[PDB]
Amino acid sequence: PLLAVQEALKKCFPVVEEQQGLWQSALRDCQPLLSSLSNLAEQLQAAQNLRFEDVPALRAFPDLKERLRRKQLVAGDIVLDKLGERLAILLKVRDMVSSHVERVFQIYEQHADTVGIDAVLQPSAVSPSVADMLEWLQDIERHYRKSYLKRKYLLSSIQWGDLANIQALPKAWDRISKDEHQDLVQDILLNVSFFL
Amino acid sequence: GTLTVTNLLEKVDDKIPKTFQNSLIHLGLNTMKSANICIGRPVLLTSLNGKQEVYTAWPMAGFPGGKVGLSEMAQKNVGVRPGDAIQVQPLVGAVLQAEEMDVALSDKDMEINEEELTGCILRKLDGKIVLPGNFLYCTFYGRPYKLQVLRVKGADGMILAKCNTDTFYFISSTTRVNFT
Amino acid sequence: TLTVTNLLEKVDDKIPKTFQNSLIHLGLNTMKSANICIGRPVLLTSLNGKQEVYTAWPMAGFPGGKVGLSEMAQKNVGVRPGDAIQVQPLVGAVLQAEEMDVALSDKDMEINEEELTGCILRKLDGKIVLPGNFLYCTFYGRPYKLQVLRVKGADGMICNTDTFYFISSTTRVNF
Amino acid sequence: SARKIKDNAADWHNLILKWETLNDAGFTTANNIANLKISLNEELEKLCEELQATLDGLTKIQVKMEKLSSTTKGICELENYPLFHTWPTTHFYEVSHKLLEMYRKELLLKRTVAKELAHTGDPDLTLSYLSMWLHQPYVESDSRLHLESMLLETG
């Protein structure tokens, strides 16, 4: 009966908690790498505003521009592959939580013929509602998916050859996070704590 | 249906909703069960002087029965003291969004940048259901304020609320405020 | 002439990723049997007739008398775990390939030849290659496989005792 | 004989390590100089002096590894009239010679960036110079690999 849906929710939530923690640590690692990458791109942007044959000392040298550029790009490539790894971990958490939420909804739609909608709307003393809990699960899956898919189409528009965009990256990245409801995961967790 | 007002025993590091942070009438679990309370739902407060104000109940553990520890500012705006009696009711009526709310300043007349204070009040007081003639508190950069609301108008159509089963209103990010 | 397993999982933090890719793994006796020499390019051949070069390396705790190979190795040669191979310590003269023909993956969704050749040249510093073989690059994660058509040696010079050629910043790329 | 070669290997390792460490310290110094310059005397002077001292430590390292190279070449020649794991032992000299050439040209570039860092104009030169100091743009990465490989054949 309805106890099945209740058990489903009690099962689904702690997963959401731990996954949120993982997401958080991932993005936390992600930040300073991207800072360093901005710095690298700037330093490179500088080193093509010269002629490297119209400065006296450097002149007594066969070729610097080429070798230095090659080294700079190797460093950049390494740091960007680190970012790629982080993005992979993000993808993992998205897919996992989406599968779980879908399982919950499917259980409900399986049973929602003997549990009158009215019984879905009994806010007890220590439990908001099965209704609002399903709603919040739905909203949390949407939040995760949109955040992930908006972070990718930012991180994969990096091309050595647009050295303004890279140098601007960190601000755009940080901004991608200051437009959701951080309270989403935080308050959902709190708000449903007493349910356990 | 009747409880003993105390002062909030505040130590809430992880005090949950980084929102309810303003309404916050704490309670006790069994007290919730007695008065049909339920988390996150509003609740009506009636004083022995005929003043009223509502608040989002919250069952923070670590409290004894009958001690519905309010906040100091509620204790002022409704005029109670730590030990009196008060009437608690579980709100049942409608709850809509409120478009027009007009309100005048206290004697701190410095003519602050109008829309700026609007921005602060909104970004600080989501969900605080209001009534005619109450007081709000939005510490806009340390500098406190104290506002007296006169009339409010909600999208449904009426314009201002003494009993429980009837209209109310609250402030959302699409509310208009007048300063007169 | 030795049997082929799959490459192990005991990768070293040293020898940065780039070279970590191009490698084959061996054991001590495997080194001291065909008398090959560490860090020196080595030739592999299948019975089908696929010859491919790599950089040999003996890894600690390798199962004696075997040779591990990369997944991309097994692909580019066409051998499965348990199969045999023909290993040869390269003793010819290795030189610097001047210019090299390339065949794309032909799914060219607006490929920037300058950028492509830059990335290729970069991620393939020490790499000898014979025609008809293939290359694997990671143009920002999105992988690419390239096919080699012809090779022009330094001295116009287009068997484990012949000459072979690697890549360098000066080598030109043609399509 | 081969014992000396193994010693040469371990010395290569520790020498390059000390190199990197001193380069780190010098990079900090050069940052200080660039900032102090951009902000607008004798303070700057003491700075340049201790930077030159860093360069001299570098030079000491260079001469030690050059001696390493020479002894290796000597043993190479003396083996005229084969090892742990069957290397040509000429290969050894080839390795050490590539290493030496790399690091020596590197030292020259460091010397020029010191020689110029004090009085520079437009800041973009300054960034490019700090770069030249840090990224060591004359040390092809495989070097470490090379060393490792050689280092591998003698524990």
> What are the beta bridge partners of residue C24?
C56
User: Where is chain C broken, named by the residue before each break, C–N > 2.5 Å?
Assistant: 158
Helices A163-177 + A2-46 axis angle, to 10: 150
**Among the residues of D39-152, which ranges form H helices?**
42-78, 90-117, 123-135, 142-152
> HSE on the CB side for D141, CA within 13 Å?
22
> What are the beta bridge partners of residue C174?
C101
Tokens at A88, concatenated: 């992979």
Length of chain D: 155
Tokens at D140, concatenated: 């092809």
Tokens at B138, concatenated: 């939005």
Three-class secondary structure of residue B24 per DSSP: coil
The conformational region for residue C65 under phi > 0 = left, psi -120 to 50 = alpha, else beta, is left
Three-class secondary structure of residue A179 per DSSP: coil
* Experiment used for this model: cryo-EM
Rounded CA-CA distance B170/B175 in Å is 9
CB contact at 8 A, B104 and B180: yes
Rounded CA-CA distance A45/B77 in Å is 61
Nearest Cα of chain D lies from the Cα of A154 at a distance, in angstroms, of 28
CB contact at 8 A, C128 and C166: yes
Q: How many residue pairs from chains A and C have C-beta atoms closer than 8 A?
A: 21
C61 touches chain D (CB under 8 A): no
What are the strands, taking DSSP E only, across chain B? 2-4, 25-26, 42-46, 52-58, 85-90, 98-104, 135-136, 147-154, 176-179
Nearest Cα of chain D lies from the Cα of C26 at a distance, in angstroms, of 14
Contacts (Cβ under 8 Å, ≥6 apart) of C72? C136
CB contact at 8 A, A102 and B5: no
C18 touches chain D (CB under 8 A): yes
Tokens at B64, concatenated: 């004894």
Three-class secondary structure of residue B100 per DSSP: strand
| φ and ψ of D6, to 5 deg | -60, -40
Strand pairing of C51-58 and C24-26? parallel
Structure resolution in Å? 4.5
Q: Please answer yes or no on whether D142 and C126 come within 8 Å at the CB atom.
A: yes
C115 touches chain A (CB under 8 A): yes
Amino acid identity for residue D34 in this structure: A
Amino acid identity for residue B12 in this structure: V
> HSE on the CB side for A129, CA within 13 Å?
15
What are the strands, taking DSSP E only, across C90-141? 94-96, 99-103, 134-139
Dihedral angle sign, alpha carbons of residues C163, C168, C174, C175: positive
Burial B150-171 (b: 16+ CB within 10 A, else e): eebbbeeeeebbeebeeebbbb
Output DSSP code: residue C13.
Answer: S
| φ and ψ of A41, to 5 deg | -60, -40
Continuous segment of H or E residues that includes residue A35: helix A2-46
**Among the residues of chain B, which ranges form H helices?**
29-34, 72-77, 114-124
Rounded CA-CA distance B28/B69 in Å is 9
Rounded CA-CA distance B55/B129 in Å is 7
Q: Please answer yes or no on whether D146 and C39 come within 8 Å at the CB atom.
A: yes
Q: Give A-chain residues touching D135 at CB under 8 angstroms.
A: 68, 71-72, 75
Continuous segment of H or E residues that includes residue C2: strand C2-6
Contacts (Cβ under 8 Å, ≥6 apart) of A89? A22, A26
Dihedral angle sign, alpha carbons of residues D78, D81, D86, D87: positive
Helices A65-111 + C113-123 axis angle, to 10: 100
Continuous segment of H or E residues that includes residue C173: strand C172-174
